[PDB]
Amino acid sequence: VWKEAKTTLFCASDAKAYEREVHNVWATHACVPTDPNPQEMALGNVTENFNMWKNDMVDQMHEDIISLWDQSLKPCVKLTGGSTVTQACPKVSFDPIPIHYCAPAGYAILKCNNETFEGTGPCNNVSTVQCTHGIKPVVSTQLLLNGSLAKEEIVIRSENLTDNAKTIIVHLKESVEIVCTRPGDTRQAHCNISEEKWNKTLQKVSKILQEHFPNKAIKFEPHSGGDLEITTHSFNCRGEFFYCNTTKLFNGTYNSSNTTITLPCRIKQIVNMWQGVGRAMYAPPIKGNITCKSIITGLLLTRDGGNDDNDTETFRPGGGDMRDNWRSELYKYKVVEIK
């Protein structure tokens, strides 16, 4: 039923009328309640092409989450170039909820059921839905949190792998739990990840990469540089902005009483806005244990360029553009027209 088109999709999610939590309050006005019995329609001997990297759904979602954060997470000061705005910045309750994107009347959404699909090119098992699955709008860098998981094997996605300026998205099959805590210096926090889980997952990622880069040695190293937002694994927990050193997660070659990796984190109040150009200053953190038990379900990587002896290909954590975070979940979808 391929008829790629552009329409304004509408959001849907199960918000609570009583909930003062910011994603809920936003969803209360922006979205509609979830269809209890959503219909899927299969398509036999039907094969169509997708491009996750050129998809209008990603941009719509991006605009929504931007306008969500703008209403919900009010900073004390917002400084932009030479201008400045200062409003009241009360503390808020914060925990993302799953948002569904849906096609209006006359249109529909194509779901790709090729569970080994790399995002671009032809797809053999295709069906039609009216809404995508539940997507948590988790804003983060380096690590993709609380996402869906690859269901057959680890998938590597890139618009062009040979193009070192294109972001690489790893979609994990087995999730790794990450627990972050600020104990009740009060700006210092720390993350905890198991070595067994993490080591193993990078071993497994090394193997898949070896297939895409034959006769090359695969090696992971820490971030090359830039703003703290992207040189650390940064993410928001319960309103507070965490910044975690991921050096220990990337320690070279991954060959083929449990022991944990402790990543040192800091809570910041002076933050670069991911929405756009600007520095935002938020309120000092709340008291007590501030804790997030999340799951790592994907990575953002960037491959090293330039001439290489030793036949070694080096990968580093990426991130920064959040559109990437959304396409890691919207890759299997395209918006079509009916005729």
Add this chain to the structure above:
Amino acid sequence: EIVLTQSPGTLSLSPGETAIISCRTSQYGSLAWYQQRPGQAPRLVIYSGSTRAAGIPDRFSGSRWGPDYNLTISNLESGDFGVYYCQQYEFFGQGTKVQVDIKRTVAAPSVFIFPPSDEQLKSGTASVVCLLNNFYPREAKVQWKVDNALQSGNSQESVTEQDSKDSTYSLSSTLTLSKADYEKHKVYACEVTHQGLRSPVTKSFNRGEC
């Protein structure tokens, strides 16, 4: 492993002729050609193999025949002379310098060989010099032979600019050895090939002779 090979190194043409520049690559990737006029920033000429950039005349064309990419420049104008580079992602070719040449009768080279001065040999280094004088066209090859043995990577050619008065070129290949490697061996010679010689010309000397 750069594996982006551009050739030829130098292309000596006239206005109105056509320049044919090449680039081998085994790697997957889009290829682009740039032009650098003397003292100016490079500019994009062809991208994606054969697509002409904006403001680039139909005279420029790109083609692909396997791993072999070509940049053909027809009806060569004076604003077309400079250095050309091919590019594939982050890598560039060595460059091809297309430079003006004035047409004239083919003229064979006059070849002279020069043994190292004894004043020099007191310093522990031997400099043999082969001179190719007043020839046309520019394409020429000099090969060194020490006792019927070809030399590798121990010589340096040097070319004058085309003469304004008689349109000829002159080349100077200098072979350098340590005094030690020169004390051995008797015969030293350079073998010159050109378009104006039916068979290669070789000029030699025995060491110690006069």
Add this chain to the structure above:
Amino acid sequence: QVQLVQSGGQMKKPGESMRISCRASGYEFIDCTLNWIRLAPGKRPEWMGWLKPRGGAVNYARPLQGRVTMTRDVYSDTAFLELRSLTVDDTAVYFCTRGKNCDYNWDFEHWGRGTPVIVSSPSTKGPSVFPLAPSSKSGGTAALGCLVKDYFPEPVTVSWNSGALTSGVHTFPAVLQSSGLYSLSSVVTVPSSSLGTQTYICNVNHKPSNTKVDKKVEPKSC
């Protein structure tokens, strides 16, 4: 109407560092990738790395890692390039580039007009002038000349008989040897007959080392 504006040219010494800027206009600074390319004469143009102004995200070419830093000032649309531990081989013209469109980095339609960086040592060496004596054996005429070896830095000028001999003279472009010094030969074709009668003086000048040398080229005695 995209525009990249680089800072002026600098002169450094082996060991120092340098910073170059590049101000962008005509487009949204953070939505497009910048690159630094350098062109050293005689060498492939070398991509040094890219920078995505959005987060300051950076990708350095393997050979330059540890010596190179790229930053940017988002509030004034300006990219920065630092290179430390400079050696002679860092002498080049440095460019910032931007792709034809912001999807594909590599089609470099847009270049700044470059920043010359000369990395030179203040050490200078005087040349050794060796004779290229004519053969005692003898198309039609004979050749002779000077071998100006091992000087630094260029240029060397050569004249013959104080400039009264110009016809038939060829002074070749200097060669940069393995040592790091230059070398050139100067030659002149003269009548084979007037060899032992006419004086031929090679006049070699080298301003950087204040060296004037007059060499007399003549065929060896046996």
